[PDB]
Amino acid sequence: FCKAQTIQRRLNEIEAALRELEAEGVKLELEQQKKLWVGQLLQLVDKKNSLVAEEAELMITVQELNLEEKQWQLDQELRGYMNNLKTAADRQAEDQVLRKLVDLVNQRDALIRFQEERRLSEL
């Protein structure tokens, strides 16, 4: 048991901030004050990039938890069969449960390399 919904709050924080910045940037697009409205705009984008960067990382961490939940919920299901002489159909179904479990490892094998390939471009 782990209420990791603290990620969700920060998610809505960023969305609002972006939706704002989206708006704030528009009113910004509407000759010494020029050089100021110049710098400010590039300062909006670097915040967006940050926010989007963070946002992606969180969503990856959301998909990860997603598959982690729908992994235990079927680990029990597998344990039902193998934990005598069940109907051969009972064996085909067990077979279909396993092909799905591998489908998740591939997924977790991707999200991990998303995390890894993302921290690598930072260098």
Numbering used by the authors: 925 to 954, 964 to 1016, 1020 to 1059
List sentences quoted exactly from the publication behind this structure.
MICAL1, identified as a Molecule Interacting with CasL, belongs to the family of MICAL proteins, conserved from insects to humans. MICALs are intracellular proteins that catalyse oxidation–reduction (redox) reactions through their flavoprotein monooxygenase (MO) domain and use F-actin as a substrate. These enzymes bind flavin adenine dinucleotide (FAD)2627 and use the coenzyme nicotinamide adenine dinucleotide phosphate (NADPH) and O2 in redox reactions, causing disassembly of F-actin likely by directly oxidizing specific actin methionines. Active, GTP-bound Rab35 directly interacts with the tail of MICAL1 through a flat three-helix domain revealed by X-ray crystallography.
The interaction with Rab35 required the last 150 residues of MICAL1 (aa 918–1067), in which the last 41 residues are essential. The C-terminal region of MICAL1 has been described as comprising segments of coiled-coils2137, potentially implying oligomerization of this enzyme. We determined a structure of this domain by X-ray crystallography at 3.3 Å resolution. Surprisingly, the structure consists of a curved sheet of three helices, exposing two opposite flat surfaces, which differs from most three helices folds that usually form compact bundles. This structure is formed by anti-parallel intramolecular coiled-coils interactions: while the first part of helix H2 makes coiled-coil interactions with helix H1, the second part of helix H2 interacts with helix H3 also with coiled-coil interactions, and no interactions are formed between the H1 and H3 helices. Biophysical measurements by MALS and SAXS indicated that this domain is a monomer, and thus does not form an elongated dimeric coiled-coil, as previously found for other Rab-effectors4647. Overall, the domain of ∼80 × 30 Å in dimension exposes two large curved surfaces on either side of the helices. The mutant S2 (R1012E, M1015R, L1034K and V1038E) and the single mutant M1015R had very low binding affinity to Rab35 indicating that both H2 and H3 helices participate in Rab35 binding, while the opposite face of the three helical domain defined by the S1 mutations do not participate in Rab35 binding. Most of these residues are conserved among MICAL proteins, consistent with Rab-binding properties of several MICAL family members and with the crystal structure of Rab1 bound to MICAL-cL48. This Rab35-binding surface (oval in Fig. 5c) explains why the Δ41 fragment (aa 918–1026), which lacks the whole H3 helix, is unable to bind Rab35 (see above). Importantly, we reveal that Rab35 activates the enzymatic activity of MICAL1 by displacing the inhibitory intramolecular interaction between the C-terminus of MICAL and its catalytic monooxygenase domain.
